[PDB]
Design a protein around this ligand. Structure first.
Ligand SMILES: Nc1nc2c(ncn2[C@@H]2O[C@H](COP(=O)(O)OP(=O)(O)OP(=O)(O)O)[C@@H](O)[C@H]2O)c(=O)[nH]1
Ligand SMILES: Nc1nc2c(ncn2[C@@H]2O[C@H](COP(=O)(O)OP(=O)(O)O)[C@@H](O)[C@H]2O)c(=O)[nH]1
Ligand SMILES: Nc1nc2c(ncn2[C@@H]2O[C@H](COP(=O)(O)OP(=O)(O)O)[C@@H](O)[C@H]2O)c(=O)[nH]1
Ligand SMILES: [Mg+2]
Lengths: 437, 26, 52, 431, 51, 145, 431
């Protein structure tokens, strides 16, 4: 009954969804064909998959996701690969031209024809529900379909569905590690549009997950598959409360009401942190206190920002596996008595914990070990102001002499939208200092 | 020049059809 | 009119001659392949003679 | 299902287009007859971008060949991989321009424009997505420069938004080979700078320098230069044809490359390049490819990028590699050679990683550079043009076709303006 | 030899198409008729008294 | 459900350490030298030993009639080879028939031929009865049918 | 079952009819000696439309060959497929027409016209349903023009209900080949008008144009011209002999094709036509069939269809197709240029899909076009006629053969009235 709809828009969204749905199939025991290979089946209690899958009445499960990309290659890779019969053919929405790293092409001209079709598909999926828990939007701020068309789709969803959970997982650019030039323009434009049309904006950084894979898993030269698997593990740990039964289940509404203090501070940090490899994983105790102290470390945040420069406001602790509450309470007490972890003065009750029975599953095509205890740490804090400032620095030093603006200007968008977006994100920064002090 | 529009319009009302009949009722 | 006639005659003659040369080139490729097979057989005989 | 229409103009355009259609047909596993003999399905997945389906397993290239004389058309059809082209796309006339840009653009070229535009319109309406047009020709010729730029103007008039890139074999400082080459090059680039989205500017003497210093081959001949140019063209267009980790097509390259619409003259570079004796011993790794890619004498333009400053860079990697090492090496090369990159653009290097290596290689990289060092080429053509024009040499041939000296003076003004835009950007400060 | 081989390979005849209508291919298929053979030998037809 | 590319991918002839290792004991311990070899050789984490383990839980010569090989004293021409003709709804090479019968062969009198009978001209059918007058005396204006 | 009686008139009519029987004999599996060496029951199912059953397995063509010379009929009898005809319906005269309409219509073609009516009446009464008459001639001489029009008038008086199609090769000013040709055309078009139910005007210069620019062929030859005309004739009448999804006889073509009775001059067509080299470079599909069939080249009249407005279009497809794609392509070619279409007739396209494509083809199509651009043909004929008639040139033959200059003037007035009728039907507004 507690059902979520996933919208993976852009090439980054499609690839992250391809990792996330194979993680979901491994978790719920669904084979890539679409059925359960359990054979004996047995009834018992087996409604845990209903968050992300639906019965067809014949044993097959179709996922509640829509894959969107304006170019026909990353979606056709899904349609050609082994997860072909799993997805319904109408949810794999493709375009003709890509948005060409251009917010104007993604938002105004090419994004205007396919938005009706993807809204129609979202309408069919919402009609095939018995109470929608929320939306899980997966995109990249880098540019194109993930920046312009994502903003268009979320503003159309805000017009249509109104009050609904709208959790998004954003591929934010790194301060140095990035693969585009008009990318700060795209980020500045999309953060102005998706600020009033979202309620949680979980941020992950490519360089930060590179450093995580280099340090903990000791993957010196990783690909996007490992990063997508880590992001999928984060999202699985988030939705484990909705899917599997546990002691303290933290749903989306409880999550938001315990996380966001103000409607414009909806930008938390995710850190799933038993993340050590199978080689150096089975020689350690891996206790609850150990994994909480691993979460509360500066060189474990999966967005490139130092939390010691800011103040923690809210923290949500999603535990996974054989986790008793007394170890949770002791670990939270030790974290609170720690002095380098500063909480803001107006939030005494800074922690909301929740324990799920089901342990994390190991992906045989991955590198994370088969651990028994897990904790994923989602902290709303004021350490992202430096990332905002770095983005503003890049945007200002390009917009000073109007480089690359003509592609946006002559193709829809006016000149002053960049100024409006810069003003909006400066107001967001000022909001962050007002909350920080 | 004669108006073949009205010519054929009157011709089909007179019941002539064929082209020889057309030219003779012209 | 006579320029139109001359242009059409030139295009048709070029098409016919080029098709003829395509056919001749295909024949030359096939006979060159047969030459290559005979040369390979000769090389195998040379290797056997070397060992002997 | 994107589409790019290939057009070849002139002897150079026809030769390197034939080599191009050899190489990409080998990439997609198409035999010279036209059938499909590949062993995978990724070849056949995106075969509609350059090949129209024919009867049976035949696959017709989407190329239009144009030259006023039949002397190179008969040869390019009778040669290898020449029986695959459609015979209706071989438009030709009686006379020839022959380094006579005025005849190629106004008198003899203009008669064939209607027929070749009919052929290109036929191909474009046969297309269903039509990403853009690529034109291969040589600046410094009659049919390649003049009629090529006339075709560029006509296709820009017909389709003012579909992408356009010209590959533009450009004059070199010492090879020369033609006494009216400055006239032809100036008059062609005057049209190109205002009517082209991406100009690539490949250089013959630079290609000799690469093919001899890196590859040995004391007889570097002609088809080898065609092969290098074709390798760069395939490495440019590979993301439209094959799946990858982070795809980027021609419009993504144009958006990330061109800051201002007149600054679109690039420097191509292909760099898994190694000698004959060094193939079995060299390791094709990402840092080594980056070093050879940013190697100065690995550039296929005769201008040294050290005498300038890079505005934007694109690297199209092909093969299975690690994104972290790729963008870490781009970060490393930017922070090392920060004096050769503009300070007012952060992240000058766009990246595009495709998962299919070129045939015969394990891991490859293609370079695009919008440096301000091509102003040396533009100033060289300008000074040769003003050396010839001040004595009115060879001008009666051009003015007997209906052309006046006003066009030459306009070409001077436009080239000098472009030189000024490239000149002020390599020394403009941020604050 | 290969000249005559290529002569044949160019001047082969064109393939004659299959001569059935679209209705005859879609809606029609071969089917032989059984007739429920007689168990009481009602086979006289000339001098048999009808039932 | 097995696909076609899995016996050709060299990345599949290994097993990830997370998939194969479920205990303290490493099934095949990779030494520091092999680990450093792969680190220096820049291997992806599908062939690297640190994360992946390989363990599991003439012809013939030509003999072609030298007699007529000598007897060929010409070359097979490709140029003439029949001319272009439009027959059978397509343009095709047609070999000319050489032989010609370009001379007329009709005769005034009706004659018996080997293909039946000669057709005989139409003014012959008026010699003895004149069945066909140009001005006939038929009182119907429509002929007998 | 219904029947068509064939009548070949003149040299051109006899040659075209001989080629027509040659092509529909091996369309039906009829050998030269007359038996049926077919390979399907569908060929023999509807053979009585054109072939009378006779002794044995001999299927005899139902055609009458007429000529006022012992020439081309001797040629037909001596040539291939010339022994299928009876020796009775080879009526001919020993005199000469002299390229004279007066001699063909009044003088010595009138003493044999009664014999031709006897033969055609015998065949028509031997028919079972007698759908109508198909007559092939030319408006450029004697026997073709005068004798043919006399035959059409007498058959119209005998049977004023059955369908009457006359194909007729219309004179060209570039081909010419006859001097009294404008007189013979002007004095016979009017006689065609009130008698023929539909006329499919063929032009020699348009046949030469389609051979030049569509079939290449260098030397086209009258044999190939007659093969192409016969192919279009068989495509017109294929629906009477083969079953299909969507049938249309000659009467259905007339009813859906001619809007007003003096507007029955059509523009035939056919569009599998590729050169021998370009035959294997085209994937034979309904879209290129439609676009080649609607191409301005493929029309077999010298009038350009963009110079007028299509009153009606009929398209008869042969083979196995999909009706959605067929109707969608017809709608698309109507919608891209509805400017070349009359606004007062919505959806003026008549599709007729039949099975059994012609021998050796995957799929074929043929065209019939009633457009107001056909007034130009009569305007050129008129402007030649008045130029010759203003000085009374070559008129002594017609006058001393028993005619009138007032009759010539009234024929000219009739043709100009027809031209004005087409002009005002073209220029009539929607409302
Ligand atoms: N973490 C992660 N980031 C990715 C992945 N794929 C792409 N990205 C990010 O996406 C950015 C590039 O822009 P894209 O997301 O590919 O743009 P798009 O969504 O494809 O839309 P278009 O530009 O119109 O093609 C890069 O800077 C990457 O950081 C991925 O698989 N994992
Ligand atoms: N790299 C390269 N250069 C070529 C090739 N063919 C011709 N060129 C150069 O092109 C210039 C002449 O241009 P040309 O082909 O004659 O132009 P056209 O007259 O329009 O055909 C010469 O300076 C040659 O060096 C080729 O295949 N490769
Ligand atoms: N298509 C075609 N046209 C022909 C043929 N023979 C003659 N013609 C045309 O007919 C015209 C002459 O008409 P003609 O046959 O002499 O009329 P006739 O004397 O009454 O038979 C010339 O302009 C030719 O173009 C033929 O075999 N095929
Ligand atoms: Mg994309």
């Amino acid at each position: 009954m507690r059902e979520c709809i996933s919208i993976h828009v852009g090439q980054a969204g499609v690839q992250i969804g391809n990792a996330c749905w194979e993680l979901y199939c491994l978790e719920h025991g669904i084979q890539p064909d679409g059925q359960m290979p359990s054979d004996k089946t047995i009834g018992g209690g087996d409604d845990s998959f209903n968050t992300f899958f639906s019965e067809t009445g014949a044993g097959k499960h179709v996922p509640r996701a829509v894959f969107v990309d304006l170019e026909p290659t990353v979606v056709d890779e899904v349609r050609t690969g082994t997860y072909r019969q799993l997805f319904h053919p109408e949810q794999l929405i493709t375009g003709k031209e890509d948005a060409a790293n251009n917010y104007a092409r993604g938002h105004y001209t090419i994004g205007k024809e396919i938005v009706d079709l993807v809204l129609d598909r979202i309408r069919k999926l919402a009609d095939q529900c018995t109470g929608l828990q929320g939306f899980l939007i997966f995109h990249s701020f880098g540019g194109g379909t993930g920046s312009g068309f994502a903003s268009l789709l979320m503003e159309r969803l805000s017009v249509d569905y109104g009050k609904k959970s709208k959790l998004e997982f954003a591929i934010y650019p790194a301060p140095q590690i990035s693969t585009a030039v008009v990318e700060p323009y795209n980020t500045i434009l999309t953060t102005h549009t998706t600020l009033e049309h979202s309620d949680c904006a979980f941020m992950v950084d490519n360089e930060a997950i590179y450093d995580i894979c280099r340090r903990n898993l000791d993957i010196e030269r990783p690909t996007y598959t490992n990063l997508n698997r880590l992001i999928a593990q984060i999202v699985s740990s988030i939705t484990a409360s909705l899917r599997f039964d546990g002691a303290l289940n933290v749903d989306l509404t409880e999550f938001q009401t315990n996380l966001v203090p103000y409607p414009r501070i909806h930008f938390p940090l995710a850190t799933y942190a038993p993340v050590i490899s199978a080689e150096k994983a089975y020689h350690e105790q891996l206790s609850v206190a150990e994994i909480t102290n691993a979460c509360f470390e500066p060189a474990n945040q999966m967005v490139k920002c130092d939390p010691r420069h800011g103040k923690y406001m809210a923290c949500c602790m999603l535990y996974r596996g054989d986790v008793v509450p007394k170890d949770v309470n002791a670990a939270i007490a030790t974290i609170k008595t720690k002095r380098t972890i500063q909480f803001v003065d107006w939030c005494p009750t800074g922690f909301k914990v929740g324990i799920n029975y089901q342990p994390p599953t190991v992906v045989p095509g991955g590198d994370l070990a088969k651990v028994q205890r897990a904790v994923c740490m989602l902290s709303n804090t004021t350490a992202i102001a430096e990332a905002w400032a770095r983005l503003d620095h890049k945007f200002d030093l390009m917009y000073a002499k109007r480089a690359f603006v003509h592609w946006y200007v002559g193709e829809g968008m006016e000149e002053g939208e960049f100024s409006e977006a810069r003003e909006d994100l400066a107001a967001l920064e000022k909001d962050y200092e007002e909350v920080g002090v | 020049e004669r108006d073949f529009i009205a010519l054929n319009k009157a011709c089909i009302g007179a019941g002539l059809v064929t082209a020889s009949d057309q030219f003779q009722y012209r | 009119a006579t320029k139109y006639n001359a242009l059409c005659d030139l295009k048709n003659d070029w098409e016919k001659t080029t098709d003829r040369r395509i056919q001749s080139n295909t024949v030359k490729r096939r006979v060159r392949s047969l030459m290559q097979q005979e040369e390979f057989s000769l090389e195998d005989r040379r290797q056997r003679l070397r060992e002997m | 299902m994107r589409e790019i229409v290939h057009m070849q103009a002139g002897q150079c355009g026809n030769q390197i287009g034939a080599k191009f259609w050899e190489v990409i047909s080998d990439e997609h596993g198409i035999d010279p007859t036209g059938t499909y003999h590949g062993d995978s399905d990724l070849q056949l997945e995106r075969i509609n971008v350059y090949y129209n389906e024919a009867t049976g397993g035949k696959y017709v290239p989407r190329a239009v060949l144009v030259d006023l004389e039949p002397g190179t058309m008969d040869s390019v059809r009778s040669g290898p991989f020449g029986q695959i082209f459609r015979p209706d796309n071989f438009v030709f006339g009686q006379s020839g321009a022959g380094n006579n840009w005025a005849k190629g653009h106004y008198t003899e070229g203009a008669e064939l424009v209607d027929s070749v535009l009919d052929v290109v319109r036929k191909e474009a309406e046969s297309c269903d997505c039509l990403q853009g047009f690529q034109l291969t020709h040589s600046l410094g010729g009659g049919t390649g420069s003049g009629m090529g730029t006339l075709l560029i103007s006509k296709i820009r008039e017909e389709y003012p938004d579909r992408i356009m890139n010209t590959f533009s074999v450009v004059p070199s400082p010492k090879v020369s080979d033609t006494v009216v080459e400055p006239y032809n090059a100036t008059l062609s680039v005057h049209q190109l700078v205002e009517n082209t989205d991406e100009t690539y500017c490949i250089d013959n003497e630079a290609l000799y320098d690469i093919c001899f210093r890196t590859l040995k081959l004391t007889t570097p001949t002609y088809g080898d230069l065609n092969h290098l140019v074709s390798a760069t063209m395939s490495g440019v267009t590979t993301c439209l044809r094959f799946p990858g980790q982070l795809n980027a097509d021609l419009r993504k390259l144009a958006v990330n490359m061109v800051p201002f619409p007149r600054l679109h003259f690039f420097m191509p570079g292909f760099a898994p390049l190694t000698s004959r004796g060094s193939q079995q011993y060299r390791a094709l790794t990402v840092p080594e490819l980056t070093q050879q890619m940013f190697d100065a004498k690995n550039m296929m333009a005769a201008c040294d990028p050290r005498h300038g400053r890079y505005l934007t860079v694109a690297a199209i990697f092909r093969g299975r590699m690690s994104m972290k090492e790729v963008d870490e090496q781009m970060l490393n090369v930017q922070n090392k050679n920060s004096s050769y990159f503009v300070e007012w653009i952060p992240n000058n290097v766009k990246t595009a990683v495709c998962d299919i290596p070129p045939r015969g290689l394990k891991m490859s990289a293609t370079f695009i550079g919008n440096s301000t060092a091509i102003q040396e080429l533009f100033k060289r053509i300008s000074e040769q043009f003003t050396a010839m024009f001040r004595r009115k040499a060879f001008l009666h041939w051009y003015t007997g076709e209906g052309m006046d000296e006003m066009e030459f003076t306009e070409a001077e003004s436009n080239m000098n303006d472009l030189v000024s835009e490239y000149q002020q950007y390599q020394d403009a400060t941020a604050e | 030899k290969v000249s005559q081989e290529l002569q044949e390979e160019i001047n082969e005849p064109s393939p004659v198409e299959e001569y059935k209508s679209v209705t005859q291919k879609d809606f029609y298929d071969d089917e032989f008729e059984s007739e429920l053979p007689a168990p009481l030998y009602e086979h006289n037809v000339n001098t048999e008294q009808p039932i | 459900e097995v696909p076609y590319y899995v016996p050709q991918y060299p990345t599949f002839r290994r097993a990830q350490l997370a998939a194969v290792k479920e205990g303290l004991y490493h099934p095949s311990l990779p030494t520091f030298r092999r680990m450093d070899m792969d680190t220096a050789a820049h291997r992806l984490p599908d062939e690297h030993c640190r994360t992946t383990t390989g363990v599991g839980p003439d012809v013939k010569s030509l003999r072609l009639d030298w007699a007529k090989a000598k007897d060929i004293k010409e070359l097979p021409q490709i140029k003439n080879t029949g001319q272009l003709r439009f027959s059978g709804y397509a343009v095709r090479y047609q070999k000319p028939a050489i032989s010609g019968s370009w001379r007329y062969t009709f005769t005034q009198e009706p004659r018996l031929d080997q293909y039946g009978q000669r057709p005989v001209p139409a003014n012959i059918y008026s010699r003895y009865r004149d069945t066909f007058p140009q001005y006939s005396r038929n009182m119907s204006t429509d002929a007998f049918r």
